[PDB]
From Swiss-Prot:
Full protein stretch here: 126 to 388 of 403
Protein name: Aurora kinase A
Modified residues (Phosphothreonine): 162-163
Consequence recorded when altering residue 221 to A: Decreases the interaction with phosphatase type 1 isoforms
Glycyl lysine isopeptide (Lys-Gly) (interchain with G-Cter in SUMO2) cross-link site: 133
Activity control note: Activation of CDK1, appears to be an upstream event of AURKA activation. Phosphatase inhibitor-2 (PPP1R2) and TPX2 act also as activators. Inactivated by the G2 checkpoint. Inhibited by GADD45A and p53/TP53, and through dephosphorylation by protein phosphatase type 1 (PP1). MLN8054 is also a potent and selective inhibitor. Activated during the early phase of cilia disassembly in the presence of CIMAP3. Inhibited by the small molecule inhibitor VX-680.
Superkingdom classification of source: Eukaryota
Gene that this sequence comes from: AURKA
Annotated ATP binding sites: 18, 37, 86-88, 135-136, 149
Native organism: Homo sapiens
Amino acid sequence: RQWALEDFEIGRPLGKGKFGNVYLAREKQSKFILALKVLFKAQLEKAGVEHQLRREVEIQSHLRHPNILRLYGYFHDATRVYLILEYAPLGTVYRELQKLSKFDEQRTATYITELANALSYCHSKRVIHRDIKPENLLLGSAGELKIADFGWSVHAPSSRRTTLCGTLDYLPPEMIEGRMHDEKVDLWSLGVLCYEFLVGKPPFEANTYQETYKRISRVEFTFPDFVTEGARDLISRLLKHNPSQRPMLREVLEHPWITANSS
Ligand SMILES: CN1CCN(c2ccc(C(=O)Nc3n[nH]c4cn(C(=O)Cc5cccs5)cc34)cc2)CC1
Ligand SMILES: [As]
Ligand SMILES: [As]
């Protein structure tokens, strides 16, 4: 089906980014509520990522999983590229985290299960190394997690330090120490994410980025007294310096703390 701008009506902005914006939208015929991400070819070419957009939209286009925000279609014109995306009505996990300061164990274990399931699916399709920070996670109508780390910034919502290798807070030891990485980086990210969910802040925070790099290399992090032994065991396992010793996603999904707290 060849979509066109004429097929949609655009509503309020859901986000503003460097490459473009994202709006609430409705498809003329079905009257279905979606999200329309609008990217400007000008900024795309300026960054020499024009061809890379279509290639990335191609792989994402075929990823169908309940915890991965669906990318339905795409069309373009002389100056803009339009991405038709599933609408997640409850917003970002990040905003929920700010509102509550931290998540309880049941909510956290549930999100971890959903992310582990989605990652499992992606890894099987050879899709790896994702930016799974709270700001890139949306929530469905039932509160289910929707991974939306397609990239191509069209929103904020924070000033967390990022690098060409990824979000600094989430960078694994291998990337900081100059070694080549593999899909095991996603397990480390899952450990950092779980920690942030339960604590409200990243485990390697420091007075300077230089010191953060050092603490990641030494896997130097501690927990607040309120985190339980079950959570500590899973996170400690995920945050192992040796990539190969981090648990398999199957082992995460079957971890005692996860099975006991995940809905
Ligand atoms: C109590 N609440 C407060 C705020 N509320 C919403 C605030 C924001 C949203 C929202 O962004 N929804 C989206 N749905 N599909 C998308 C593709 N998006 C991006 O590509 C842009 C991205 C943003 C993050 C990752 S990718 C973004 C969306 C929904 C509700 C309503 C009621
Ligand atoms: As993925
Ligand atoms: As890199």
